[PDB]
Enzyme design. Structure first.
Site, PDB file in Angstrom:
ATOM      1  N   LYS A  94       0.622  -1.238   0.046  1.00 30.90           N
ATOM      2  CA  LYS A  94      -0.081  -0.040   0.078  1.00 30.90           C
ATOM      3  C   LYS A  94       0.987   1.310  -0.115  1.00 30.90           C
ATOM      4  CE  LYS A  94      -3.801  -2.049   2.737  1.00 30.90           C
ATOM      5  NZ  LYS A  94      -3.338  -3.578   2.643  1.00 30.90           N
ATOM      6  N   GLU A 116     -10.159   6.705   4.836  1.00 30.58           N
ATOM      7  CA  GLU A 116     -10.679   5.953   5.739  1.00 30.58           C
ATOM      8  C   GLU A 116     -10.157   4.706   5.887  1.00 30.58           C
ATOM      9  OE1 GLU A 116     -12.327   4.579   1.528  1.00 30.58           O
ATOM     10  OE2 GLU A 116     -12.046   6.605   2.638  1.00 30.58           O
ATOM     11  N   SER A 369       2.075  -9.485  -1.346  1.00 33.12           N
ATOM     12  CA  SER A 369       1.488  -8.174  -0.872  1.00 33.12           C
ATOM     13  C   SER A 369       1.918  -7.754   0.287  1.00 33.12           C
ATOM     14  CB  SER A 369      -0.088  -8.107  -1.185  1.00 33.12           C
ATOM     15  OG  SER A 369      -0.667  -8.944  -0.408  1.00 33.12           O
TER      16      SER A 369
END
Ligand SMILES: [Cl-]
Lengths: 385, 354
Positions: A94, A116, A369
């Site tokens: 991310k 959020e 990931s």
């Protein structure tokens, strides 16, 4: 670092018929201001140079393309390589996108970033990056989530972010997104809204991909320097995130003989395949977060660019059961000494169904990931062996 | 990519008057063999090659020497660089040592590797490299620790190792096992206070940290740092950063080790160990300490300004740098070692802070 200039999306944010920005007139000005500011930034060497410095020094890039010898022998098929995104700061992939978006916020003059978060990883990724650049940070989080995520909530407070509980509706991520977007619209002049998903309105889908693309470009280079050629197949978990997008995009738009791309999604509860594949076969499409895409009307959708990939035939989408994913989870840890995030374990599960049949000289890259330390307890809840 | 050949310790494992340890007669032959194998291993290119390959592709080395700008501006003193050992796989610097030792065990023909652990950090590190090399792993843990560390116990179990039950009761139970099955077992120790050749071995495998900082400093400053700071305690963090500098003819950076605020089981020993003791006497390194409250403040200072949540241990060094960096000049450079990440101590720090 060199941000790509892929043939898609188009000026309107369309990947073929998919994409666009089906949003209220209140969001329009903010999104167009963003798109314009982003188009400029991606061309500027000053931005590129700075982004690259933080990816290397802060995030810890480039991540190694690790040869899982034990895994390769166990399956007895192609040689298996792991793109170690788990070795990134915060522990997630991310951060490539969060770092890029926060830097664009600073460049646009914004002194405030909001987002959020459901599970909490995004909220921490954003809080972490805001700390790096010294930006005020506010993370909207449903109340339900706030109670079952004490740790990540504390981390965000440690990082200096303000965690703003959302009681509205069902007190979940869904609600948090509305409170957040509204905040961004009202405070657009001073605030930037950081979205980490590939499903959203233009230019978010294009921007997230571009920032995540550093994953595939590294693989592309590391491979050429390792095998003198590109991989035979790339496998990554898909599910409204961005993990697969970063790996895929650098190969999707290449000529004829590009490597095969395999997106692995979670079996749709009550289905034999994932929602995406199911939508592809049924030909059901619809709008989600102002984005036209395949929609089986886990995530309700996987995004417009993945929808385009399916029709363009550059990537196929498969699924695995919850059990096969746990089997993949336990497998990697036992053979390689790497505990992968549950998302990635899904990619491991699928590779189990196709790597053994391949030739021993072929190369396969699986995308890791993030790290599974976050999922250990959830997996241990079903305590056993 | 070779290993270090430092002047100390001597053939017997002594750093000046330090190093001597009381090792029972039945342990002496296992320690002598370990020395022989190790000395022979560091001569083999193929061995150095595999270590480096794994250190890079598996652990993630080299780690970045990060410039903590907001924190250098805050203290107003010298420039502060953080040796990011927190980015390593597993999150701890100790993996440089376990990877090396499990590799040694494989070369020695061992198929089993044992260890003991308290909070579980060592148990996981060992279990990890055990799965990586296909070695059988057994970790000795105490009944108590095993109940308070449900996560690590599970992690270890996922890594394929067997966890068999105070850590004190787990150490001398392991040494026994090691002796009995020495022919087939290797004992991984991540401490710099044990008997020769463990302190030398751990120091050698950890040296990679200091050497990296030495070349990273040279490429970015054209000269070595003014001061290197690292917490000295659980582990071999400070030794890996220190050793490659402590024996330099001169131009040596000031080395500052930071310390924290009864019964000896197995091979454990009180203190910082032989090498840090020798550094102090010879005067090539000085030591200091900070209060629990000061380190707690460092934990928070680095989280807020750099976005990095340090291990409580690294927070001690941070806290100490807080007392010397501001005085210094903005043109001077200071390197702080971040042994591991604090995503573990964050639950603890969360308690004693409301
Ligand atoms: Cl994706």
């Amino acid at each position: 670092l060199t941000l790509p200039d892929f043939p898609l999306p188009d000026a309107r944010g369309r990947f073929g018929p998919y994409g666009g920005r089906y949003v209220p007139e209140t969001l329009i000005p903010a999104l167009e201001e963003l798109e314009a500011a982003y188009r400029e930034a991606k061309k500027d060497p000053a931005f590129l140079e700075e982004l690259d410095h933080y990816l290397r020094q802060f995030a810890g890039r480039p991540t190694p393309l690790y040869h899982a010898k034990r895994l390769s022998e166990y399956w007895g098929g192609a040689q298996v390589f792991l793109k170690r995104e788990d070795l990134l700061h915060t522990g997630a992939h991310k951060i490539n996108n969060t770092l890029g978006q926060a830097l664009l916020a600073r460049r646009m003059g914004k002194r405030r970033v909001i987002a959020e978060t459901g599970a909490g990883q995004h909220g921490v990724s954003v809080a972490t990056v805001a700390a790096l650049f010294g930006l005020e940070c506010v993370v909207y989080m449903g109340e339900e989530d706030v109670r079952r995520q004490a740790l990540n909530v504390f981390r965000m407070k440690l990082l200096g972010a303000e965690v703003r509980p959302v009681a509205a509706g069902s007190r979940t991520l869904k609600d948090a997104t509305n409170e957040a977007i509204r905040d961004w619209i009202t405070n657009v002049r001073t605030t930037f809204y950081i979205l980490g998903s590939v499903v959203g309105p233009h230019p978010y889908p294009m921007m997230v991909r571009d920032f995540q693309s550093v994953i595939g470009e590294e693989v592309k280079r590391q491979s050429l320097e390792l095998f003198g050629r590109l991989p035979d197949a790339l496998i990554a978990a898909v599910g409204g995130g961005s993990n697969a997008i970063g790996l895929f995009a650098p190969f999707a738009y290449l000529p004829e003989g590009r490597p095969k791309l395999i997106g692995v999604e979670a079996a749709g509860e009550g289905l034999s395949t994932g929602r995406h594949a199911a939508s592809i076969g049924a030909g059901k499409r619809g709008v989600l977060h102002g984005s036209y895409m395949y929609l089986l009307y886990d995530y309700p959708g996987v995004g417009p660019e993945h929808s385009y990939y399916a029709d363009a035939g550059v990537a196929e989408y498969a699924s695995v059961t919850d059990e096969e994913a746990l089997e993949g989870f336990k497998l990697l840890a036992r053979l390689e000494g790497i505990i992968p995030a549950l998302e990635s374990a899904h990619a491991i599960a699928y590779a189990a169904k196709v790597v053994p049949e391949m030739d021993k000289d072929q190369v396969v890259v699986i995308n890791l990931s993030g790290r599974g330390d976050k999922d250990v307890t959830e997996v241990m809840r079903l305590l056993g062996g």
